[PDB]
Symmetry: C2
Subunit: 109 residues, 2 copies
């Protein structure tokens, strides 16, 4: 139940949302003189998105482990030589436990 579920016609919620989307989108394209509108709602699917976003500011450094090996935090320790970099990421974690890791942004200094 983490994916979409088909529906729909017997509710204006979906229609009024199709209109929103279509005027919103088409009022930004090039070559456009008119709003686009809805000729027909063909299919509707809903999917609940619930979880929590983890914005992590981190000191990051080259570890002792090679990419060829399986990463373990207890033994892939930070190299005493390595430069520390201040980095930011967001990790999203829905109820299922599935995580996605936004691309690290790091201060260049």
């Amino acid at each position: 139940f983490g994916g979409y579920s088909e529906r729909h016609q017997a509710n204006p919620e979906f229609l009024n949302l199709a209109h929103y989307a279509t005027s919103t989108w088409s009022a930004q394209q090039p070559g456009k003189t008119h709003f686009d509108t809805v000729a027909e709602v063909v299919k509707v699917e809903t999917q609940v998105v619930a979880g929590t976003n983890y914005r992590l500011t981190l000191k990051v450094a080259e570890s002792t482990c090679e990419l060829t090996s399986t990463y373990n935090k207890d033994t892939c320790l930070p190299k005493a030589d390595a430069a520390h970099r201040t980095c930011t990421t967001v990790v999203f974690e829905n109820l299922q436990g599935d995580k996605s890791v936004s691309p690290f942004e790091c201060e260049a200094a």
Copy 2:
């Protein structure tokens, strides 16, 4: 309230998320031969995500209304001779009512 609430080093779960994020991200990085790891969890901000994703399949048509004007589902009807296109889009809506629209992926046909 609808944004990042701060928290953080004492907490194992945040530490585990920081290792997951770091190991995962740096693996996919080019040039890199070793894993990056966590020297330090500096800051942790969380953020509850609640909403519904609406995937829409639509028939779209040029409307009677100019872009220089206020769209109205009841006034901006589809032009009688306008070609219809089958378009897909997702519309997220948070618990507040604030909506986002993915770019309409139309159909080449």
